Amino acid sequence: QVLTQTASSVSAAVGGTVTISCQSSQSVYKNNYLAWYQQKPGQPPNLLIYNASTLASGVSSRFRGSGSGTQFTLTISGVQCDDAATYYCQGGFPCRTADCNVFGGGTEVVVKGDPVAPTVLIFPPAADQVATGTVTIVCVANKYFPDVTVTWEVDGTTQTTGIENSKTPQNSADCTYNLSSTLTLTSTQYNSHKEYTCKVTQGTTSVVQSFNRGDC
Amino acid sequence: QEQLVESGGDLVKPGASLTLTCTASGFSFSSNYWMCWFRQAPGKGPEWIACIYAGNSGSTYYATWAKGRFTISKTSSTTVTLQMTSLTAADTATYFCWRRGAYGYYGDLNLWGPGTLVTVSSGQPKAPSVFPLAPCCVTLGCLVKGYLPEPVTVTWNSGTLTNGVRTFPSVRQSSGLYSLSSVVSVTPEVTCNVAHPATNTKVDKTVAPST
Amino acid sequence: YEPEA
């Protein structure tokens, strides 16, 4: 069987409501063998609802499962930052005639909190990086919402490669992200330029953090 | 009380084989449930692989794509294995063991392990380099660069310092090696403690407040 | 008896 969910992402402000849809290619077992799971990075699926609409033990009543047969909904009322997560439907069928269980592909929930401008820091390569032949410059944008864009500029020239970005999940207290952006260069290329700039844009706000190679 | 723990996940060559174990604690295999495996590839959702009935049947069930290369067995009253063959990079994932409750008891019997990570790669384990992160000559940090396989752990001051700590998700480079950063925003010296179990690596790096 | 599901 195949289970198809809403879309990859949905959003709502603290206190608002999210709707996540799940369609099964064939009727789940007895029309209600359908579970909802929450998942945060690094953890196994955490059961929210089973039998289509029954709240698992200790789960908050602002999670609501509905539907029957092939069409199901999860509704999250009063969204909190702690609901920032991916949500999966899982259908159940007779093992002897179909897949025992089938997961949908997931719907992420993005929870819109109070906006916070990023705290931006740039970190020159430690001296002992250079000896390795490669150097990694690290920029972080800490505690921010909504999403930002990072640009690297080396002696004013926008960088397009050597860059890796890594964003934390939304903080469960305040909905904020943290972002680490790294520019990797050979030691010789690194030592061919003077100024390294990390420019972080949130909306029309720009934070620029820079260093000159020689000042380190 | 009742728990599952997956083991056996490792770095493994393309074309090679690996056996994973799911170990039950707090109970033994009786009946009225199945023990199943799922996997979840990085930035993807979990997908079903196989189930085995806990009762006398020992009936086994497999996703279409899996029945070639995967074998699910009960190897004791508390262990179920997943043997995986002809592995390719497509098989890199966290593998989870699950207890599937019969209808009427799905919620009651639902139990998951924390997962075991399987890394299908041609390279050999590699220890990270750990480099201090500090402002050009306060937020300080450690860059944990160039390790394989996952995971690493990073603590600060032996774990006593957790407020103001931001450890970022690892990223896998084109080399196939991983990197990750941790930073800590402090106002009395700070030391990152980095471990890479796979290579027996433990590194403490006390981060000076500038370069 | 292995249940149907």
Side-chain angles (χ1 to χ4, degrees), chain A residues 2-216, chain B, chain C:
Chain A
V2 169
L3 268 67
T4 296
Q5 285 181 234
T6 267
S8 318
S9 193
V10 296
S11 164
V14 171
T17 295
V18 164
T19 268
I20 298 172
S21 301
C22 171
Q23 168 169 54
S24 183
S25 63
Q26 70 187 87
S27 283
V28 300
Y29 184 66
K30 289 211 167 100
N31 297 139
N32 61 358
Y33 190 158
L34 192 290
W36 286 102
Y37 285 85
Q38 185 195 60
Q39 191 184 36
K40 292 178 171 166
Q43 289 288 316
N46 179 13
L47 182 62
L48 296 172
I49 287 165
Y50 61 87
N51 298 346
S53 51
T54 302
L55 214 55
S57 178
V59 171
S60 168
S61 42
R62 46 205 196 62
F63 292 92
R64 184 174 218 60
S66 58
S68 184
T70 57
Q71 291 269 77
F72 305 86
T73 307
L74 184 69
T75 309
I76 315 174
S77 287
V79 174
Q80 312 171 14
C81 297
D82 187 57
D83 302 336
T86 305
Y87 294 80
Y88 296 97
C89 54
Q90 190 212 60
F93 317 82
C95 291
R96 294 179 67 262
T97 56
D99 287 359
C100 293
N101 295 88
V102 176
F103 265 115
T107 302
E108 189 182 70
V109 171
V110 179
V111 179
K112 299 186 304 193
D114 288 342
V116 184
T119 303
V120 179
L121 299 146
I122 186 164
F123 295 106
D128 68 312
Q129 285 199 53
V130 169
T132 72
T134 83
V135 136
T136 300
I137 312 145
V138 178
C139 184
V140 297
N142 282 351
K143 199 183 166 90
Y144 69 79
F145 193 93
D147 274 310
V148 304
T149 290
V150 174
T151 299
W152 288 87
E153 299 176 352
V154 177
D155 290 335
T157 293
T158 276
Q159 302 296 287
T160 58
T161 64
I163 300 170
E164 281 170 346
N165 295 315
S166 188
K167 191 174 70 180
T168 55
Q170 289 190 274
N171 186 272
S172 63
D174 70 12
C175 291
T176 60
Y177 294 110
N178 311 295
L179 176 70
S180 177
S181 188
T182 70
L183 174 64
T184 299
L185 293 176
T186 70
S187 304
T188 63
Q189 298 170 310
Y190 172 72
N191 282 308
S192 81
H193 309 298
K194 185 195 185 198
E195 194 199 57
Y196 293 81
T197 295
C198 180
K199 166 146 63 175
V200 173
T201 308
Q202 193 188 54
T204 57
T205 277
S206 267
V207 183
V208 173
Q209 292 293 287
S210 285
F211 70 87
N212 297 317
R213 187 171 58 69
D215 304 351
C216 313
Chain B
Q1 205 215 336
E2 303 195 2
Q3 71 178 20
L4 304 170
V5 181
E6 310 84 340
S7 56
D10 211 345
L11 188 65
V12 53
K13 300 283 187 54
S17 178
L18 200 66
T19 302
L20 304 187
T21 305
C22 175
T23 309
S25 297
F27 69 108
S28 78
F29 305 143
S30 58
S31 70
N32 197 48
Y33 61 80
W34 302 255
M35 296 305 305
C36 309
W37 286 91
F38 298 82
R39 63 182 192 180
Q40 183 173 20
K44 297 246 170 263
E47 61 184 338
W48 182 61
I49 303 171
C51 286
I52 191 158
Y53 187 51
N56 286 118
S57 265
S59 312
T60 59
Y61 307 100
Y62 296 92
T64 293
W65 62 262
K67 60 175 180 163
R69 285 185 311 121
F70 298 76
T71 308
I72 188 166
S73 320
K74 194 222 204 117
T75 62
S76 86
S77 60
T78 65
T79 57
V80 161
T81 61
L82 189 71
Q83 176 174 357
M84 317 179 307
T85 63
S86 299
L87 292 170
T88 84
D91 297 309
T92 299
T94 305
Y95 287 71
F96 297 99
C97 187
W98 179 55
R99 179 169 72 185
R100 179 194 195 244
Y103 181 85
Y105 306 92
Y106 177 105
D108 187 48
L109 290 169
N110 170 248
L111 193 61
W112 290 79
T116 192
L117 176 70
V118 164
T119 312
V120 183
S121 159
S122 292
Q124 297 294 319
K126 187 172 167 290
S129 299
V130 178
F131 300 112
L133 301 170
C136 200
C137 200
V138 69
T139 303
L140 306 178
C142 286
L143 172 68
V144 180
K145 184 178 196 306
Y147 61 94
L148 181 78
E150 292 267 53
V152 291
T153 65
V154 187
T155 68
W156 290 97
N157 289 356
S158 305
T160 62
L161 181 42
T162 68
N163 293 296
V165 171
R166 300 177 162 74
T167 299
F168 295 92
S170 67
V171 282
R172 200 174 185 188
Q173 289 75 70
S174 288
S175 66
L177 301 177
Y178 293 84
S179 295
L180 82 62
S181 275
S182 187
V183 297
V184 62
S185 295
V186 295
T187 46
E189 266 291 22
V190 306
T191 301
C192 67
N193 324 101
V194 178
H196 183 235
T199 58
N200 205 29
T201 294
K202 273 163 56 173
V203 167
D204 303 310
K205 187 73 66 188
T206 294
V207 177
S210 79
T211 75
Chain C
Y1 176 78
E2 182 180 349
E4 177 175 44

